[PDB]
């Protein structure tokens, strides 16, 4: 079991990473296997929060989401070693939905045909000796996936 | 182009309700997040309501309950239902256009709300 | 959630002086939240410095951002006399909120 395969480079938030595991801390809250999946990524302390069923804010709405019926727990430490987030997006992510594209937004009338400028920005945005809260916190989500067949855990 | 006008303010009794009206022209309201800035006379900006371009709504404390935001696609006006209507609320409103890092760049002349019997 | 504090409540000068604009955060908050505005009477406010020294666009260079942590300051190297107004310094957190302003009068 590569547990320890987990826990040098880590992914951002909005490039979030999940592992097929089979055959095999400052915020632990639990709430509910054929499957289990292994989600990593960081986001800032204030934005733990945005991991958990019935989910509002910027990192909820696009950059990660839980699909309101989570069988499974969160799992997360503190300050980090070693990072970006979605802003702009014009509708919320599904539940378990990564969005990778880097098209620059459209937020008038006008397009931007992939040039920066009025109206037209970079979704994604850039992330010691500040507050906690604002220092990165690695998050680790697992997933679990049960259905009518043999089990793997 | 790019402007955002405010309208619907008008005199309403204690307790009772308004909506307001913010046109948007050269800019996307659903593309946006649209916020609600009122200023009370002789007083500052108060933030009163936020809401997300994937439809999340945010309010403040002393609005909780009360007040609630929409916006109408077809139309690109954004607005504002307000209930329960005390002293508290006379004030100008403003609807600003929010980028989160980068500030708030787009502002309104806004409309005027009283509130007295 | 975020408190702001200006300091002090009226900043008295004249033209061509140096203006030392203070905002106090009560919890030490981020350097890309601040914004800057300008309220002159009659009108909508203006931004001015985004995220902690940043002029947005059509904003004269005399008009500079600076501060970490809880404390931050706007500064004007020259006072133009059109740039005596209210001005506001501001945080988001979860829900966007503002201090209370400070007046730029004209000193005599």
């Known amino acids: 079991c590569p547990f320890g395969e987990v826990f040098s480079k880590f992914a951002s938030v909005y490039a979030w990473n999940r592992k097929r595991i089979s055959n095999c801390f400052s915020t632990f809250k639990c709430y509910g296997f054929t499957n289990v999946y292994a989600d990593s990524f960081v986001v800032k302390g204030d934005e733990v929060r945005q991991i958990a069923p019935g989910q509002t804010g910027v990192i909820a709405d696009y950059n990660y989401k839980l699909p309101d019926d989570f069988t499974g727990c969160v799992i997360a430490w503190n300050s980090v070693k070693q990072y970006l987030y979605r802003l702009f997006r014009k509708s919320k992510l599904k539940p378990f939905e990564r969005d990778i594209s880097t098209e620059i937004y459209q937020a008038g009338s006008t397009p931007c045909n992939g040039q920066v400028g009025l109206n037209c920005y970079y979704p994604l945005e850039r992330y010691p000796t500040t507050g906690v809260n604002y220092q990165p916190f690695r998050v680790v989500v697992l997933s679990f996936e049960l259905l009518n067949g043999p089990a793997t855990v | 182009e790019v402007q955002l006008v405010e309208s619907g303010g008008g005199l309403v009794q204690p307790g009772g309700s308004l909506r307001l009206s913010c046109a948007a022209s050269?800019?996307?309201?659903?593309?946006?997040?649209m916020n609600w800035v009122r200023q009370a006379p002789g007083k500052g900006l108060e933030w009163v309501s936020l809401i997300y371009s994937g439809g999340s709504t945010y309010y403040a404390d002393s609005v909780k309950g009360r007040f609630t935001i929409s916006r109408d696609n077809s139309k690109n006006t954004l607005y504002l239902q307000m209930n329960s209507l005390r002293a508290e609320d006379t004030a100008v409103y403003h609807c600003?256009?929010?980028?989160?890092?980068?500030?708030?760049?787009?502002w309104g002349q806004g409309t005027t709300v009283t509130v007295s019997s | 959630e975020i408190v702001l504090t200006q300091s002090p409540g009226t900043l008295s000068l004249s033209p061509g002086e140096r203006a030392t604009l203070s905002c106090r955060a009560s919890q030490s908050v981020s350097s890309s939240y601040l914004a800057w505005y300008q309220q002159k009477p009659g009108q909508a406010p203006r931004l001015l410095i985004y995220?902690?020294?940043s002029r947005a666009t059509g904003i004269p260079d005399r008009f500079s951002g600076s501060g970490s942590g809880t404390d931050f300051t706007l500064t004007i190297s020259r006072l133009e006399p059109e740039d005596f107004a209210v001005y506001y310094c501001?945080?988001?957190?979860?829900?966007?909120?503002f201090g209370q302003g400070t007046k730029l009068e004209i000193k005599r």
């Open positions: 995220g902690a020294s």
């Open positions: 050269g800019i996307t309201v659903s593309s946006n997040y």
């Open positions: 501001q945080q988001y957190g979860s829900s966007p909120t």
């Open positions: 600003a256009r929010d980028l989160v890092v980068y500030g708030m760049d787009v």
